[PDB]
Symmetry: D3
Subunit: 182 residues, 6 copies
């Protein structure tokens, strides 16, 4: 939020080709990357060094956002995109939803969409139709990551509620696209 006195790239990427089923994700943090959190400055069209993760824990899945969306929290809709090889930071991928990881943090709701590329793009993930198809070990791994990664950030905490499905994820997209347009 910029104040009245002062206020006197990425933003041109569409949210999706066929929302909410077919959406675009701009990658911020590749899976397994060294433990540095980058957050897109949507104005500037650049990735910003946001935090050196105090726990040194790495994202177990790629992390990114859907451009032209605004979730309640002030963030765009944030997305975890599962792939067999980490994606390049700052790249864009066409995606479909598997579901939602429901969480809350010290500041409020903190839900993350779970997504994969389209089947034609990534045949390796074609077998994942919904959140329930994601391997148990990987869902547990993703949950534990969110619960623990900010553990050494003063003031901060994260609690996971559980998972929800495709309908829940489409609602987040729908709402986020609506919010961004006012």
């Amino acid at each position: 939020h910029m104040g009245t006195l002062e206020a006197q790239s990425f933003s041109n990427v569409p949210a999706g080709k066929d929302l909410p089923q077919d959406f675009n994700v701009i990658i911020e943090i590749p899976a397994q990357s060294e433990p540095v959190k980058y957050e897109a400055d949507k104005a500037l069209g650049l990735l910003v060094v946001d935090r050196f993760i105090g726990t040194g824990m790495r994202y177990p899945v790629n992390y990114g956002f859907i451009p032209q969306t605004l979730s309640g929290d002030g963030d765009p809709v944030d997305v975890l995109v599962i792939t067999p090889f980490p994606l390049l930071a700052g790249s864009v991928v066409r995606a479909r939803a598997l579901g939602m990881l429901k969480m809350t943090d010290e500041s409020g709701v903190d839900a993350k969409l779970v997504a994969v590329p389209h089947d034609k793009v990534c045949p390796m993930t074609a077998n994942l139709k919904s959140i329930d198809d994601v391997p148990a070990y990987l869902k547990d791994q993703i949950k534990h990551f969110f619960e623990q990664y900010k553990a050494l950030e003063k003031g901060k905490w994260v609690k996971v509620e559980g998972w929800d499905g495709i309908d829940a994820a489409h609602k987040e997209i729908t709402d986020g696209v609506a919010n961004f347009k006012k």
Copy 2:
């Protein structure tokens, strides 16, 4: 091709400082990178996750394009740039031509220019004057890659015709620059 109803960064990079001899290449896929094909969205100025290579085969040389060019196929002029270390995705390099790899695929002509940086930039490749100087093992390796990488993409095939020289490569550049301007 965008339809009439709907149609109602990279594009500002010049094709070259002194065409067709001295041209610019924007890198899409670094040599030896994990087997994910990225293709520049010239409009958006971003690299797009295009395909997870079904064979898992990696590019043996850097892959990129000359901005502000349009080959017959709808692609910009595509270029293989040989370097002693892989180049950064999304970077640009001033280049000179060694020749052409002539190929056709299920969709039509599929020729790729072979290039190296300028000698001042990359003294390691100064000894490469023409395609014939490229080591045999590496030309065979590049040919085999193109013949096999799409082997597990349904509908797709690639056939290599052989190699051509600097004059042939300059013609591709000349023509591609001409086409892009109409």
Copy 3:
């Protein structure tokens, strides 16, 4: 085979704790490693630089052998071990069989066992009970690799017959352990 005139580590590792169901695999080539083939010198207890893969193609799965085995071909029983992260060259892993990839090359039979670590060691692969559970894309990828990797080795060729199951893989182990003892 050493001649009479001249003949005048790894060998102390058991084939398995409970053969043929539970066997040990010493890793030679990690999945996704740079395209250099290493083969254990069982006498010397060292990995030997065997070949720079002419195609530059990388192993899509870890490659190793079961110590104290002798297949017909003169090799130990060779094994492909599937893991979510590449294993360290020269390490050993306790393994269970999924099946067999049946192949022949210019020199004769060329069958490879397909294996995973034990479930307690690697919960990520616990869902793989047999060869049929291995993702299609990965089996196709493994087949294509074996068909193509030696393509630029003069005199050499490899043909894949298809896959077989756990019973077939246990027979290879049983026989290989028997052969090694005479």
Copy 4:
């Protein structure tokens, strides 16, 4: 522990040149390595694939053991060795102690020595005289790792007691060398 019926490399490396002040550490898990736990088979002189870390968390410091030692737990004395670049698995380094990380797990005492190479070997760590010189962020990071890494291993838990100094670490070495000789 091997039973009477059945019982009918690394072991030749000395514990240390000048114990307990100057000791040797054989590296098992490099700092920042992919999340696979290796444990030396002291008999066989090989690193064994022990566990795919369920949390996917990586060691923030190198992990190894002092050969020819036996701590109460059945393990050799285990050591965390801090270096500016990860060490090679299976290598050996001459080391000096900074202190001890005191912990207990479901099975009993679980103390880890904290060490660095000698100053001549590693001038980068010469400024670390005792555990207290280790950066706070890194000690917190190491503590959090041990508390959380086994979080998804059924039956397992780890509690950290706190840190102790050089005298405490020398006692662990002294005792461990004594135990190993009976």
Copy 5:
């Protein structure tokens, strides 16, 4: 400098939030990256392949520039940013100054600012208040790098004068921001 006849992204990033104390650095060359020098084309908003370092020596610290600055030499103000993990090329980081490395080369003054991220962003570097806190081995390493990296570039040389402090670094920023505005 563009000539009159011809003259007929990054530039929109502010020099700093609170100059000269709080400034932004756009990263060009990550610490420890393969030995390829990239220099931002401030016009085009792209990283340009500038040189394959003839010595093959790698930057021991991240290298970047402060946008909207013009030092005497024609370059923006150039900055070395120290971090515990290399930063992504083309990313931006909010930074504070430690001091200056004073140098001259064949072409004139060649001073480099030394910086770290803000403490909240990077708690690992919070202990570095001034150039004097930077480990001796690392300052010697940085000096030796600048003295030697261009050793095999014909015509080129670099001499290091020594280090200066925070006041000197703020002057470079102040002046560089002033120059860029005319």
Copy 6:
């Protein structure tokens, strides 16, 4: 040299199959590896952390030794092995000589053999018949490395004399094999 009072793997690897033309090299430091010098403990059959290179400079070519050799300096014959991808530390490669890099250091002669794998093993280096075929940029790079890498080691220095050929390299091997046998 061990004193009388105290004196009261690798060593079993032959120097070569057909000396001095065909010899074996055990790799200690891979090309381009992080700047940590490892030296084989020939007794123990392990790689030892020898030095964290004060300059942080990396070996531009693989570094290893010929087992069962003793050069004047007390070292085995040391060898630089050129390959298109770095070799695994602790592996062994069959090699042929290109020549010698003649050098002296504070302690005496300090000559290094220059070698490549056999042509069948590494077709990529088949074009290198003698030292003169090695690219100029790479010989300059290797020379500069040896001149500078120990620059920040107190007491130490290295001077390069120049290069010699295959006959000179065979003499070093011949002599080194002779010395090792007394």
